[PDB]
């Protein structure tokens, strides 16, 4: 009765069943503002029975409590006004059933629904991982007054617009709205109203609505962008931008402070995400909430006006696809004719077949990708001119709404080389896509490849959940409890480099973390930033201008606070712009932010330089050989490639005894080989010269005589 998953701790004391709670199937309702959700009248009259009883007893309509329970059991004509007067400013906690991180419980204001389904604002769905394929959510009512204020001031859906795991906005517009924007702000080389001039964005929308221009038709407009270059003062600058009609119509919705160049591009999904991010960093919270709603409304409206279907003709088969398959069939015919005559080995045959089918797969993908990305060729006033296509599946791929390169590849080009459950690949690919028919064997190999994926997700989720449990029970205690621990120690944040191009820049690692000692400017001994400044975006831009090497920054593991973490050694709040407040539980949000992506994770010669810069060596003890190539007498030598500015751009590990084509502090060319060794032969190279003696080397007991067969130059083994 104590232990286990169903004891008292895990089943009745940590998790309890709860009154004033409800549950139903969700649906969309896109008319909502993002602080409110739809909630049915029947659930609203059941969850709010005591508030309705109190309201009915206040007016004087009834007397005893019984009378009120008969009134709402009968549901007379007067209790719905009582219900709209108990709802009004009273938030509710919506909760999707697998809550993984804190954005899966958010507080809304109810708007009453004729119906039996919770209407949930669409942007908020990307926080809940809630699609609408049969999902269900629970509603909880904050009873007391402190809980209503916590739902409005901490857990309201307008307050959760940044994910706590990072700095990325979580109210990013998901799928229909980015298609509506990508169709709206685009262009074509001829439309109605090509190259006419417009006195404002208002008559741009008036020309689109009356039927005199097109939504994408390039046009000089006169827009007035407000740049706030002073200290909190918005300065108007008006100019003529060569833009389209749709970019002016979308400029009618952008708030004042953002520049016009945030809408001047084509606006896929990454661009609209950084649009909302720059709006949040400049204009704050309230314009970003109202602008997120206006983005969603105009995306839905012009996606409705777009009529962006999907057909069978939209998946354009490459004309070059059949000749590519026949050239691959001729190549496997040559390899198997060598296999009948035994010239090549079996593993080299299998490797050659997988290599030519990978090459033919890449060529088929490039054929279809050219045939989709620039298929439209329309003339304007004369000879033809090409542009990016308005194919429907290509806008669904290029916009980033739904689709990638691989999925649009499998609908038009060949769907690769599927792998059997043995783990090794199958030498005969699936040359037929989905627009052509798969025959029987090809679909069966496909089912191998997809049954493995479904089994992996349905067994992966248990380990992901148990990982989140272990993480929030090791964290469980750690609360921000001071304001400064009073130290000078902290870890040394450098950009990380594996050996390719510089993977994660320093601005991703030292964004919003308080420096340990004051960072010297890279010239000489300057106080560039002081020693306890939070590094927000302005400081990080003044770090990127000066090309700062690495920052000694304060880390949580170096915090000197007994029983908790001080407010500076944590860093930025991450979903609030400022430092972490005294109190906010960081262990639980950290454990959730590590364990929450557990589902997306999977479950089951020499050095060639790439760029062109300067050489530097670390952990090096070296010697010049007879020929001149600086060989190394240390195993653990790090070969860095430093640029002309001071930051470290490349790093490699060079073994004991390697032939370096270059030396210390030298300038090289891009692509020149600078290192060489033999890993199958461990070098026993020296420091000095002289003659060689065999000390304790006796043939017969110590060493042996193995004269070489095919060469004759013997060696004492």
């Amino acid at each position: 009765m104590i232990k286990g998953k169903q004891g008292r701790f895990r089943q009745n004391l940590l998790g309890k069943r709860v009154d004033y709670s409800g549950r139903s199937v969700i649906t969309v309702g896109p008319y909502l503002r993002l602080h409110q959700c739809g909630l049915p009248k029947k659930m609203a009259l059941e969850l709010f029975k005591p508030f309705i009883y109190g309201k009915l007893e206040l007016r004087g309509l009834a007397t005893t409590i019984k009378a009120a329970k008969k009134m709402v059991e009968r549901e007379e004509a007067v209790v719905w006004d009582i219900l709209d007067e108990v709802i009004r400013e009273h938030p509710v906690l919506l909760n999707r059933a697998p809550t993984l991180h804190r954005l899966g419980i958010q507080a809304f204001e109810p708007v009453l629904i004729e119906g039996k389904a919770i209407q949930l604002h669409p942007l908020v769905c990307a926080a809940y991982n809630a699609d609408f394929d049969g999902d269900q959510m629970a509603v909880h009512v904050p009873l007391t007054l402190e809980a209503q204020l916590e739902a409005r001031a901490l857990m309201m859906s307008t307050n959760n617009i940044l994910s706590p795991a990072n700095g990325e906005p979580i109210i990013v517009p998901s799928q229909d709205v980015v298609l509506g924007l990508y169709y709206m702000t685009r262009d074509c080389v001829n439309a109605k109203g090509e190259g006419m001039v417009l006195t404002g964005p208002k008559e741009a929308e008036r020309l689109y609505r009356s039927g005199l221009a097109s939504l994408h038709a390039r046009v000089k407009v006169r827009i007035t962008e407000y740049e706030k270059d002073a200290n909190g003062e918005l300065v108007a600058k008006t100019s003529l931008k060569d833009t389209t009609v749709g970019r002016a119509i979308l400029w009618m919705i952008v708030p004042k402070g953002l520049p016009y160049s945030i809408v001047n591009q084509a606006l896929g999904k990454k661009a609209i995400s950084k649009m909302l991010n720059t709006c949040y960093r400049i204009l704050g919270l309230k314009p970003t909430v109202i602008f997120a709603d206006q983005i969603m409304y105009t995306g839905f409206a012009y996606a409705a006006r777009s009529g962006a279907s999907v057909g069978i003709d939209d998946m354009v088969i490459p004309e070059k696809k059949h000749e590519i398959i026949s050239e691959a069939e001729a190549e496997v015919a040559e390899i198997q004719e060598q296999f009948q005559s035994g010239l090549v080995t079996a593993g080299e045959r299998y490797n050659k077949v997988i290599d030519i089918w990978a090459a033919a797969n890449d060529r088929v993908s490039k054929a279809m990708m050219d045939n989709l990305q620039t298929e439209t060729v329309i003339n304007r006033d004369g000879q033809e001119e090409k542009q990016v296509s308005f194919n429907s599946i290509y806008m669904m791929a290029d916009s980033g709404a739904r689709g990638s390169a691989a999925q649009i590849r499998q609908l038009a080009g060949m769907r690769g080389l599927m792998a059997k459950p043995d783990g090794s690949i199958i030498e005969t690919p699936i040359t037929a896509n989905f627009r052509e028919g798969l025959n029987v064997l090809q679909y069966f190999i496909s089912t191998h490849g997809a049954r493995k994926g479904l089994a992996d997700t349905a067994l992966k989720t248990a380990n992901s959940g148990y990982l989140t449990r272990r993480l929030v029970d090791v964290a469980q205690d750690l609360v921000v409890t001071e304001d400064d621990c009073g130290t000078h120690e902290g870890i040394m944040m450098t950009p990380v480099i594996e050996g390719g191009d510089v993977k994660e820049p320093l601005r991703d690692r030292v964004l919003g973390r308080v420096t340990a000692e004051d960072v010297l400017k890279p010239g000489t001994a300057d106080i560039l930033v002081p020693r306890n400044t939070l590094l927000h975006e302005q400081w990080c831009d003044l770090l990127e201008e000066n090309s700062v090497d690495a920052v000694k920054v304060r880390s949580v593991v170096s915090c000197d606070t007994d029983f908790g973490v001080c407010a500076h050694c944590y860093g930025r709040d991450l979903a609030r712009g400022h430092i972490i407040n005294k109190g906010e539980a960081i262990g639980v949000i950290a454990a959730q932010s590590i364990g929450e992506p557990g589902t997306q994770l999977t479950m089951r010669s020499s050095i060639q330089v790439k760029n062109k810069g300067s050489i530097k060596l670390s952990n090096v003890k070296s010697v010049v050989n007879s020929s001149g190539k600086l060989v190394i007498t240390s195993r653990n030598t790090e070969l860095k490639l430093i640029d002309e500015f001071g930051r470290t751009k490349e790093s490699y590990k060079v073994p004991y005894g390697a032939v370096l084509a270059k030396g210390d502090g030298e300038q090289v060319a891009g692509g020149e080989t600078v290192a060489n060794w033999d890993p199958h032969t461990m070098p026993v190279i020296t420091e000095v010269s002289g003659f060689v003696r065999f000390t304790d080397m006796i043939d017969g007991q110590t060493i042996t005589r193995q004269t070489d067969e095919l060469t004759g130059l013997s060696s004492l083994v």
Binding site: I105, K116, E150, V310, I312, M396, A397, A401, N439, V588
Partner: protein, 1223 residues
């Protein structure tokens, strides 16, 4: 030629490959298994006769009486199936067994018995199977699901990597009997051979050889070959066959015949072996360092002194050679222990063995098996001689002996059920051979190594359990038997057999409640192959490879119909053409291919036969003779799909449906969908509710007919003929004379099952689809069941669907529906609820059925009689009264009167009452007042329901728009349902678009026929257009013989086609795209499939024309007013003070653990405090809070949770003193 309901509406059948084998009867697994169980089959195999011939004749321990068997029988069921479902009894039959007791005198093995007696005794009742493959166990209709388990017979498994943490492989070998003790052999990383019995302790394996009366020398004779050292002129020369030197280093000087063959240092090559065989080299003189490591084979004793020189399996040293050389044993037999091939595993196991003779071997085995209790000669010998060698407690069946002889490459396949010495020795030899290198392991997912149990086998095993209990009872009564004063029912007892067989058919992991909401769902729950159950693997443990699809599933198990979630790939569903082998394996049809010409003869194969042959592909182009039109064709050799020549193949696939099952071969354009979305599509297609008006999929596959007939939901005519059609109650069919018996003049009267409850509260209802005075043939359908339309299979309905974003109302997967869908009642399904009321005599007198309902006023006496119980049929809702059922002394009187649950409406369709003999009948005792009331809610469609197509496109219907706001094309018709195009590039289920275009073309032909028949034309133009519609395109199978339809069957066909011409697009040989375009050109529709659509709101054109077509959309039984729930305050549990759980219990939401972590992640300290103290558990806190709310004071007085004090008392009820400290 066609039958007469085939000429009603003949579906346009694409499909190029001529089918050679028609689809077998889809319920044949269940029916053939249970027809094997009950059948009078002489020669004994298989059935109930096998059980009676195993258990009988019973003779007691020399008690001079021997009860023997004659014959058995099953009488009539006392209750036919309908009144059996109504009453609640099992649908069973009494098992009348003739038993003949003969009783001996003293000294009669051969003497004639002194007296006989014989009677038709009664043991148990066995549940018969309904004609559709179901049981009726206790009123409810259940299905036994066929198991998939490991075959009996030896398996050589490896476990190559994980043990020893050193990369050293092991090799174990399990001899799995069908009934009895498990025997496993296994290596250990010291390269020693170990036996274990029934997963017990580990014994070194040669002790079992020493238990079979084998001395050490006989064991070394078995597992080792002898090397002969002859004592000769000098240094004790060696016989050397040159095979033994293969791959080793020459340690000494290899010379003979005055010639140095191979010197020291170089390894012996096979050319040197050829030199020694050409030079005829056997006897060579060895150094003394060569014998100084070898091991003796047999024993040798010093002859004159009379003592032992060396025991068998002893390594040799030089002084041991000085011992044995001087005695006079000239031959020395040594064990050839090759480090490469012939390893010394048995010999080192003999060195591990602490035993020496047979008796100590049996004592050690008895101390392993049964510990504590002493090991004496009789007890240990009886144990080991009945472990494997008696016919009672160890029995490899015929399957087990076939697999056991097949895995050891024996010639025969039939043998005795027990093991022997030679079988255990052969398993050890094959295991050693696998360790040496020759031969390989077996895999467990290979469906030649994986048998199917079915209903007859499982019920026969349970019946054999009951019979061995009743024979132990008969042996009990007979030795205490006094004669002649007993007749054979004081000996025998009907109780244990009935108890065991009702234990299996009631409470087992495979006798389970039938998914009955759909003809598809019935017919695909009966064809189910579960890996679970008794003796099989579990859901929460294993694994990765048994959840995965293996290349022997091609044509035996559906690759794509397996339920997603916790059990994927354990609950496999059987393929369309796959029968079951004689031994229980899965054999699938193939077409025998002797030479170039592919012959139309079929031939069935299992996976241990499919590997040897080369089997072609279903769709490989062959023209007019069977010759493959290419010179190379894709086949598969040994589970490897590869390209072979024109003339090498021995078999071809029969038809191209045969890979998948009957759930996922109803999906048209399957080959264009992804595998994941075909899985989700088939699993949702099982879940469809039957609509009120069944509607004929325009894009089907033609397998709708076989599923709708073979699942017994339609009233298929038994004997052909005409009709009398009284039908209000029953279809009356007059029989044609050729099918009519000479006596029993006879006309067939079919019973239509009208509105009644299914197992999933849906409505199963049959409607006659034949008129009066109309010819029907044998096998034709007469009454359309639930979800059927003229014998086809109509799960959902076909609706006009536009693919576009429409103002956000179809955002993620939502679906936006017109009002024309909800006005026409074209999804308004009918649900039926059974509600029981009983008035049991709990305590303080019996309860009572009277209208004189108390406290409650004239709001009780209303939908009832003048004095009790709901009248018959009104529009009852929630909070009404159905059966007044309240007691006095329970003012102190109360209201238990079964009412209507909260939120439901309906019409009382039926009231059953077999009550306590007095209500003013046939039922069991105990229960007194038994009133069952059948409501029938009619649920329409609403924002929040779930619809889905056949391709995996799920959706929660979001907005129910008016007709005006819909996107209308320029012809004027609104579109019915708007889906979302963004699902289609990601979820790669592109088949729904081809279904959309081809359904658009189907309704294009239907609109064209509706114009030609409404604006009425004489039938020449209709038969010309129908002939053009049925020719249409490439080489197909259908064409039609349309000029023989008598100028009226053209018109009745064209009356049944004016809603759209139905098109069969088969599974993998479906309609190509050019035929879709060509059919869209026959109708007057645009070729692209896309029409320009205007907007109903703004009246102005959508740019970039959108896709409109007809998709067959289904309503799944996840309805929103079965999920909507809310709770403010009501009842809680007993032990804890927290609220109850569920909806049927009016309970609240479990605010689980991760939600508490999410509130801790915010600063919600007060929200969490009321979330676990006031709202949930603390009783003083929640009563003070309810009074504080209704006063108008939102403030909580928290206190301590009650379940924590429950924790304190449960911890404190140990020896633990947990407290609560200082203030």
């Amino acid at each position: 030629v066609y039958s007469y309901t085939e000429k009603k509406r003949i579906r346009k059948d694409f499909g190029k490959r001529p089918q050679v084998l028609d689809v077998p009867y889809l319920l044949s697994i269940q029916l053939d298994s249970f027809q094997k169980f009950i059948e009078q089959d002489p020669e004994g195999q298989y059935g109930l006769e096998a059980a009676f011939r195993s258990v009988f004749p019973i003779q007691s321990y020399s008690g001079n009486s021997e009860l023997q068997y004659v014959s058995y029988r099953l009488g009539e069921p006392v209750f036919d199936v309908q009144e059996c479902q109504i009453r609640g009894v099992t649908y069973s039959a009494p098992l009348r067994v003739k038993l003949r007791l003969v009783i001996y005198e003293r000294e009669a093995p051969e003497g004639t018995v002194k007296d006989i007696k014989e009677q038709e005794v009664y043991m148990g009742e066995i549940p018969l199977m309904t004609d559709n493959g179901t049981f009726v166990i206790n009123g409810t209709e259940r299905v036994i699901v066929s198991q998939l388990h490991r075959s009996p017979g030896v398996f050589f498994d490896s476990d190559k990597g994980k043990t020893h943490s050193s990369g050293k492989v092991l090799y174990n070998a399990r001899i799995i009997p069908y009934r009895g003790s498990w025997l496993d052999f296994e290596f250990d990383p010291k390269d020693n051979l170990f036996v274990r019995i029934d997963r017990r302790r580990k014994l070194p394996a040669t002790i079992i050889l020493r238990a079979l009366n084998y001395t050490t020398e006989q064991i070394l004779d078995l597992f080792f070959e002898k090397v002969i050292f002859e004592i000769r002129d000098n240094k004790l020369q060696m016989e050397l066959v040159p095979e033994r030197l293969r791959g080793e280093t020459a340690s000494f000087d290899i010379e003979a015949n005055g010639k140095v063959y191979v010197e020291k240092g170089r390894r012996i090559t096979a050319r040197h072996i050829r030199q020694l065989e050409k030079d005829d080299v056997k006897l060579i003189e060895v150094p003394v360092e060569y014998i100084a490591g070898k091991v003796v084979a047999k024993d040798y004793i010093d002859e004159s002194t009379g003592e032992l020189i060396c025991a068998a399996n002893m390594e040799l040293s030089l002084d041991l050679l000085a011992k044995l050389s001087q005695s006079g044993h000239k031959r020395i037999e040594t064990l050839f222990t090759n480090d490469l091939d012939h390893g010394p595993y048995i010999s080192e196991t003999l060195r591990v063995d602490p035993t020496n003779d047979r008796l100590s071997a049996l004592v050690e085995i008895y101390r392993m098996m049964r510990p504590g209790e002493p090991p004496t000669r009789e007890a240990a010998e009886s144990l080991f001689e009945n472990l494997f060698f008696s016919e009672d407690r160890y029995d490899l069946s015929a399957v087990g002996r076939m697999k056991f002889n097949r895995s050891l490459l024996r010639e025969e396949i039939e043998g005795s059920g027990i093991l022997s010495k030679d079988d255990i020795i052969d398993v050890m030899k094959k295991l050693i051979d696998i360790r040496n290198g020759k031969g390989e392991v077996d895999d467990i997912d290979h469906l030649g190594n994986r048998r199917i149990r079915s209903v007859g086998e499982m019920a026969e095993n349970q019946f054999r359990v009951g019979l061995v209990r009743v024979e132990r009872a008969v042996k009990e009564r007979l030795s205490l038997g006094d004669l002649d004063t007993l007749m054979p029912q004081d000996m025998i007892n009907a109780k244990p057999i009935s108890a065991a067989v009702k234990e299996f058919f009631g409470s087992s992991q495979l006798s389970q409640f039938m998914d009955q909401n759909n003809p598809l769902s019935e017919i695909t729950h009966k064809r189910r192959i579960s890996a679970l159950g008794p003796g099989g693997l579990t859901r929460e443990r294993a694994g990765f490879e048994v959840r995965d699809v293996h290349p022997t599933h091609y044509g035996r198990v559906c690759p794509i119909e397996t339920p997603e979630g916790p059990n994927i790939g354990l609950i496999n569903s059987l393929s369309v053409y796959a029968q079951t082998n004689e031994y229980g394996f899965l054999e699938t049809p193939y077409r025998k291919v002797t030479d170039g010409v592919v012959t139309d003869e079929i031939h069935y194969l299992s996976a241990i036969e499919e590997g040897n042959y080369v089997i072609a592909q279903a769709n490989s182009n062959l023209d007019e003779e069977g010759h493959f039109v290419e010179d190379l064709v894709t086949c598969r050799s040994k589970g490897e799909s590869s390209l072979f020549s024109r003339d090498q193949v021995d078999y071809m696939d029969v038809s191209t449906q045969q890979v998948v099952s009957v759930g996922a071969s109803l999906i048209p354009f399957l080959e264009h969908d992804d595998a994941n979305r075909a899985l989700m599509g088939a699993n949702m297609q099982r879940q469809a509710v039957p609509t009120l008006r069944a509607d004929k999929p325009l894009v089907g596959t033609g397998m709708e007919r076989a599923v709708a007939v073979d699942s017994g939901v339609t009233a298929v005519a038994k004997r052909g003929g005409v009709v009398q059609y009284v039908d209000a109650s029953r279809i009356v069919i007059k029989v044609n004379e050729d099918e009519m018996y000479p006596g029993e003049a006879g006309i067939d009267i079919y019973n239509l099952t009208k509105y009644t409850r299914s197992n999933q509260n849906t409505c199963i209802n049959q409607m006659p689809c034949v008129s009066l005075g109309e010819p029907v043939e044998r096998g034709d359908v007469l009454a359309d069941g639930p979800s059927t339309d003229l014998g086809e299979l109509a799960l959902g309905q076909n609706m006009r669907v536009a693919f576009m974003p429409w103002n956000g109302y179809n955002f993620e997967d939502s679906i936006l529906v017109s009002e024309r869908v909800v006005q026409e009642d074209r999804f308004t399904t009918i649900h039926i609820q059974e509600l029981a009321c009983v008035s049991r005599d709990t305590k303080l007198g019996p309860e009572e059925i009277t209208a004189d309902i108390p406290n409650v006023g004239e709001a009780a006496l209303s939908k009832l009689d003048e004095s009790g119980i709901v009248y018959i049929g009104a529009e009852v809702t929630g909070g009404d009264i159905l059966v007044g059922k309240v007691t006095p002394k329970g003012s102190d009187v109360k209201d238990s009167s079964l009412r209507v649950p909260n939120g439901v409406s309906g019409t009382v369709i039926d009231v059953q009452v077999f009550t306590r003999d007095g209500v003013e009948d046939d039922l069991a005792p105990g229960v007194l007042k038994i009133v069952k009331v059948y409501l029938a809610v009619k649920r329409r469609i609403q924002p929040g329901d779930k619809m889905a197509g056949r391709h995996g496109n799920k959706g929660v219907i979001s907005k129910i728009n008016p007709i005006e706001d819909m996107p209308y094309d320029e012809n004027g018709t609104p579109v019915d349902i708007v889906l979302n195009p963004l699902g289609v590039p990601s979820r790669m289920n592109i088949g729904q678009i081809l279904e959309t275009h081809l359904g658009m073309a189907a309704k294009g032909i239907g609109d064209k026929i509706n114009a030609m028949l409404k604006q009425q034309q004489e039938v020449a133009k209709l038969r010309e257009f129908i002939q053009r519609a049925y020719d249409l395109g490439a080489d197909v199978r259908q064409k039609v013989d349309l000029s023989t339809f008598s100028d009226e069957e053209v018109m009745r066909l064209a009356e049944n086609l004016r809603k759209g011409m139905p098109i069969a697009t088969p599974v993998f040989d479906g309609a190509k795209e050019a035929e879709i375009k060509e059919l869209l050109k026959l109708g007057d529709l645009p070729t692209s499939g896309q029409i320009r659509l205007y907007d109903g709101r703004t009246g102005e054109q959508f740019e970039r024309p959108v896709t409109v077509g007809y998709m067959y959309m289904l309503k799944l039984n996840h309805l929103v007013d079965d999920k909507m729930h809310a709770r403010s305050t009501g009842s809680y549990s007993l032990v804890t003070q927290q609220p109850l759980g569920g909806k049927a219990q009016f309970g609240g939401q479990r605010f689980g653990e991760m939600e508490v972590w999410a509130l801790e992640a915010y600063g919600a300290a007060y929200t969490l405090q009321e979330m676990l103290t006031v709202k949930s558990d603390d009783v003083n806190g929640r009563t003070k809070m309810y009074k504080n709310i209704v006063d108008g004071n939102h403030q909580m007085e928290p206190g301590m949770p009650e379940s924590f004090n429950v924790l304190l008392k449960e911890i404190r009820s140990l020896g633990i003193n947990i407290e609560l400290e200082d203030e």
